[PDB]
Amino acid sequence: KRITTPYMTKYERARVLGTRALQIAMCAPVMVELEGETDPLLIAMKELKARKIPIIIRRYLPDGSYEDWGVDELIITD
């Protein structure tokens, strides 16, 4: 089991959108079907709403242990 919270925080949302926008800015594949949007951050938000970002957030408990959470399996919200 994984005991930390299943809600994605605002910091995880911010850094996932940041890393995915910097990866869309360099010539990486786009996991969704883009429709003319040119800003990489808007494309990262389309990949976040459609649950398609390939990032695994590594949450660190402060004793040293860790927990691999997928981005697509956290309860994302505003």
Partner 1 sequence: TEGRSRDGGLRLGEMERDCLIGYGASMLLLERLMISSDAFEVDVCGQCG
Partner 2 sequence: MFVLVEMVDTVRIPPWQFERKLNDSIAEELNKKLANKVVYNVGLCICLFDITKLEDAYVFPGDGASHTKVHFRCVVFHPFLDEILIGKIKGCSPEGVHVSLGFFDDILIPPESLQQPAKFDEAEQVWVWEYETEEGAHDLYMDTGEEIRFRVVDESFVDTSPTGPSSKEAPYTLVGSISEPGLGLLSWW
Partner 3 sequence: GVSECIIMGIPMNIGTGLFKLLHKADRDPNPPKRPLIFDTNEFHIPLVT
Helix (H) or strand (E) holding 21: helix 10-25
> Under a CB-based contact definition with an 8 Å cutoff, are residues 56 and 68 in contact?
yes
Q: Which is nearer to partner 3, 11 or 33 (CB)?
A: 11
Please list every residue in the chain followed by a chain break, i.e. its C lies more than 2.5 Å from the next written N. none
Per CB under 8 A, does 60 bind partner 1? Answer: no
x-or-dash string of contact with partner 2, 9-48, rule CB under 8 A = ------x---x--xx-xxxxx-------------------
Binding residues vs partner 2 (CB under 8 A): 15, 19, 22-23, 25-29, 54-55
